[PDB]
């Protein structure tokens, strides 16, 4: 047999969706910085 012309188009479509969502989430999961951050607290925290 063969491959459906629409099937490959749909696979391309949802691959594009997948990659754009990797971008969206990888940006959104690193969008804001700590108020202090680990090394500030390490510097301040005494024995």
């Amino acid at each position: 047999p063969f491959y459906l012309d629409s099937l490959e188009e749909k696979r391309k479509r949802q691959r594009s969706e997948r990659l754009e969502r990797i971008f969206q989430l990888s940006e959104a999961h690193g969008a804001l910085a700590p108020v202090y951050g680990t090394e500030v607290l390490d510097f301040c925290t005494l024995p």
């Binding site: 047999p1 063969f2 491959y3 459906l4 099937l7 749909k10 949802q14």
Partner: protein, 394 residues
């Protein structure tokens, strides 16, 4: 050209002359206690004034031509002169075969058919292949369709890649119309009216009210619900053959909820099982069988080898056979297979206008079609390579 298009199935005999014949005949004989001594062959059942309590003499068991005498009488009669005239000489014949006929059975057939009727090719071919030819005819672009043979005592999920029955992913399942009917017979009589002998009348009911409930659980709930509504509404007034000839469903407006009719009619039947029987056809393991409903087997087939094929596979689903007539069959079958098929992969479940004659229509076209005078096989060639030529072609 003109061909004795044959459909020798246990319950149906869609034999024709390639000229708009579509003639269903009983591939069986009948003995009627009422009709003293008469083995009514084929349509001679219409001669029986009272078809009550008929003893069915079946040439097929699990669909495997046996006793041969029933089928002989039938065939002869069919040809005869009264049904299809005495026309053999050149009137080549086309024959259907169970998917995996047990060689010897239809090998002996081949012999008899040739050197006992003697007339141009038999071109014996599984009904599924003929229906596949017909489908591909009306569906040129399409590639692989299931001959979903929801028939008498059979139901096959079958790969058909362009007139190529893949004898690897074919699920013969089981539990066809025959079973359904018998199961009802028991259920009906044991529940009420121990009439489980008439068969054919119960069969009337079996294809008079029975249906594929869309939501089995919900439908159940309603049917088993006191008072009116509750779907129910069958009260199939079975005929005693002294009053009427075929039974019928009483109109809902005339149904007496108390079940006590004054008319003297055999006024039983209580519904519910209406959807249960077809449900068994779909939802298995209820009766006791372990095979999976045709939807499951469909998907199973689709998941075969040719990953590119599978998409076309369900995009060409062809619910053929008898059982397919069951109301809701098409929609139910689709629903299940679709919920089982890969989302992206599109599922197309269709059903022939008459999934009973579809085979005969196909075979007729094939007869008219060329590459059938080519290919082929008859006594002419059977006179040299025994049956080897036959099996080589089929």
């Amino acid at each position: 050209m003109t061909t004795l298009v044959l459909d020798n199935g246990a319950y149906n005999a869609k034999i024709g002359y390639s000229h708009e014949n579509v003639s269903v005949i009983p591939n069986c004989q009948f003995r009627s206690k009422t009709a003293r001594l008469k083995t009514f062959t084929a349509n001679q059942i219409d001669e029986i004034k009272d078809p009550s309590g008929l003893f069915y003499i079946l040439p097929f068991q699990k669909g495997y031509l046996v006793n041969w005498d029933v089928q002989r009488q039938v065939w002869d009669y069919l040809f005869g002169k009264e049904m299809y005239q005495v026309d053999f000489l050149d009137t080549n014949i086309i024959i259907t075969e169970p998917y995996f006929n047990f060689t010897s059975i239809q090998e002996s057939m081949n012999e008899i058919l040739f050197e006992e009727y003697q007339f141009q090719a038999v071109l014996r071919v599984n009904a599924g292949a003929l229906s596949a030819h017909r489908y591909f005819r009306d569906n040129p672009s399409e590639l692989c369709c299931i001959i979903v043979d929801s028939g008498y005592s059979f139901t096959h999920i079958v790969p058909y890649c362009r007139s190529k029955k893949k004898k690897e992913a074919i699920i013969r399942i089981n539990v066809g119309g025959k079973l359904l009917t018998n199961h009802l017979k028991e259920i009906i009589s044991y529940r009420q009216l121990h009439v489980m002998d008439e068969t054919h009348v119960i069969n009337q009911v079996k294809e008079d009210v029975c249906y594929v409930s869309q939501d089995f659980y919900r439908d159940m709930d309603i049917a088993k619900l006191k008072g009116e509504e509750n779907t129910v509404m069958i009260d199939y007034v079975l005929p005693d053959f002294s009053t009427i000839k075929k039974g019928f469903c009483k109109p809902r407006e005339e149904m007496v909820l108390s079940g006590k009719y004054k008319s003297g009619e055999q006024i039983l039947r209580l519904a519910n099982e209406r959807f249960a029987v077809p449900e068994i056809l779909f939802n298995p393991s209820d009766i006791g069988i372990q095979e999976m409903g045709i939807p499951e087997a469909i998907v199973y087939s689709i998941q075969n080898l040719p990953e590119e094929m599978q998409p076309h596979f369900f995009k060409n689903i062809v619910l053929t056979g008898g059982n397919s007539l069951f109301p809701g069959f098409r929609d139910r079958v689709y629903s299940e297979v679709r919920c089982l098929t890969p989302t992206d992969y599109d599922v197309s479940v269709v059903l022939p206008e008459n999934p009973i004659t579809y085979a005969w229509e196909g075979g007729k076209l094939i007869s008219e079609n060329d590459d059938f005078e080519d290919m082929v096989v008859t006594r002419e060639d059977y006179e040299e390579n025994g049956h080897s030529v036959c099996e080589e072609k089929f």
